[PDB]
Design an enzyme around this catalytic site. Structure first.
Site, PDB file in Angstrom:
ATOM      1  N   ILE A 299       1.083  -1.425   0.046  1.00 19.61           N
ATOM      2  CA  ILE A 299       0.033  -0.086  -0.222  1.00 19.61           C
ATOM      3  C   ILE A 299       0.695   1.147   0.090  1.00 19.61           C
ATOM      4  O   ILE A 299       1.710   1.701   0.635  1.00 19.61           O
ATOM      5  CB  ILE A 299      -1.420   0.233   1.029  1.00 19.61           C
ATOM      6  CG1 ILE A 299      -2.070  -0.923   1.394  1.00 19.61           C
ATOM      7  CG2 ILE A 299      -1.908   1.396   0.769  1.00 19.61           C
ATOM      8  CD1 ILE A 299      -2.640  -1.627   3.033  1.00 19.61           C
ATOM      9  N   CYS A 300       0.430   2.454  -0.920  1.00 17.84           N
ATOM     10  CA  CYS A 300       0.772   3.201  -1.491  1.00 17.84           C
ATOM     11  C   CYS A 300       0.037   4.481  -0.112  1.00 17.84           C
ATOM     12  O   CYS A 300      -0.642   5.182  -0.367  1.00 17.84           O
ATOM     13  CB  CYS A 300       1.503   3.876  -2.482  1.00 17.84           C
ATOM     14  SG  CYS A 300       2.620   5.794  -2.216  1.00 17.84           S
ATOM     15  N   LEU A 301       0.834   5.117   0.961  1.00 23.31           N
ATOM     16  CA  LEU A 301       0.328   5.813   1.863  1.00 23.31           C
ATOM     17  C   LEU A 301       0.952   6.322   2.384  1.00 23.31           C
ATOM     18  O   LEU A 301       2.009   5.855   4.175  1.00 23.31           O
ATOM     19  CB  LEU A 301      -0.746   4.390   2.849  1.00 23.31           C
ATOM     20  CG  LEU A 301      -1.365   5.810   3.741  1.00 23.31           C
ATOM     21  CD1 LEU A 301      -2.549   6.530   3.197  1.00 23.31           C
ATOM     22  CD2 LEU A 301      -2.766   4.719   4.410  1.00 23.31           C
TER      23      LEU A 301
END
Lengths: 140, 145
Positions: B84-86
């Site tokens: 997850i890109c967060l």
């Protein structure tokens, strides 16, 4: 102690595979880049110098099951090789004959397994074995 | 070897669960959480159920928890392996944030995709209507059982 679960361990090894270790004589990566289970790995070994394996590249399949790394992975050569502990017709690695696999610790990894096999290529009983021609692979 | 804070967060999650999010610690590892996020209404993920897993590294809460989807999902900020890109999972992580905060953010992330490389993210930019319908198709296929 702080245990890292299988999947997060395997992500760590995925990342270490990309960055690479040491002299690059062994390498590893995910077999299928969409395998969210991180189960099937491609392994590579460069034959050590001053053995009959030298200047040869060996591809391997490494399977990390649901209990990895508490339990050892399954290993088989794809590239044909004459070597103690490697089944002559299937290429499967007999765990009982590879100390890292027979005496597995959860501190081990795919890297350790590949480095172990490559070390064993330098042993007295393996290094002088007459090898098949290059370019041969097992079935399946 | 187990911070009081972790014991507190765990107990608060079990007693005050986040709506739409199930999250429980693993039977064999107190730093390991099994998560199920319901696809938010009015998003192409609606109706679907998404498996995640969370892990608290030793240096929590100085470092961020590690989170990953285990359900195949068509989203700009999730890759083929569920990573997850967060921002709060790396550069923008602060110890004032909780495990609870992470899951809410991921849940929010489903309602508001962040196209701004990545092949999926490119599709969400150049053709958003098509990308949404593909996310919906993937929800039907991989997030219903």
């Amino acid at each position: 102690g702080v245990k890292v679960p299988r999947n997060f361990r395997l992500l760590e090894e995925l990342e270490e595979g990309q960055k690479g270790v040491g002299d690059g004589t062994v390498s590893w990566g995910l077999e299928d880049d969409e395998d969210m289970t991180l189960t099937r790995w491609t392994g590579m070994i460069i034959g050590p110098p001053r053995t009959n394996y030298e200047n040869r590249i060996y591809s391997l399949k490494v399977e990390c099951g649901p209990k990895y790394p508490e339990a050892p992975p399954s290993v088989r050569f794809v590239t044909k090789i004459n070597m103690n502990g490697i089944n002559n017709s299937s290429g499967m690695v007999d765990a009982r004959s590879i100390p890292v696999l027979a005496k597995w610790q959860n501190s081990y990894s795919i890297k350790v397994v590949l480095q172990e096999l490559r070390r064993l290529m330098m042993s007295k009983e393996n290094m002088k074995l007459p090898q098949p021609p290059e370019g041969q692979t097992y079935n399946n | 070897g187990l911070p009081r804070r972790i014991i507190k967060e765990t107990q608060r999650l079990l007693a005050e669960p986040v709506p739409g999010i199930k999250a429980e610690p693993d039977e064999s590892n107190a730093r390991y959480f099994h998560v199920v996020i319901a696809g938010p209404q009015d998003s192409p993920f609606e109706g679907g159920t998404f498996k995640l897993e969370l892990f608290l590294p030793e240096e929590y809460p100085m470092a961020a928890p590690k989170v990953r989807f285990m359900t195949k999902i068509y989203h700009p900020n999730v890759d083929k392996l569920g990573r997850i890109c967060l921002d709060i999972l790396k550069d923008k992580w602060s110890p004032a944030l909780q495990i609870r905060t992470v899951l809410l953010s991921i849940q929010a992330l489903l309602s508001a995709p962040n196209p701004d490389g990545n092949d999926v993210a490119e599709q969400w930019k150049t053709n958003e209507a098509q990308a949404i319908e593909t996310a919906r198709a993937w929800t039907r296929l991989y997030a219903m059982n």
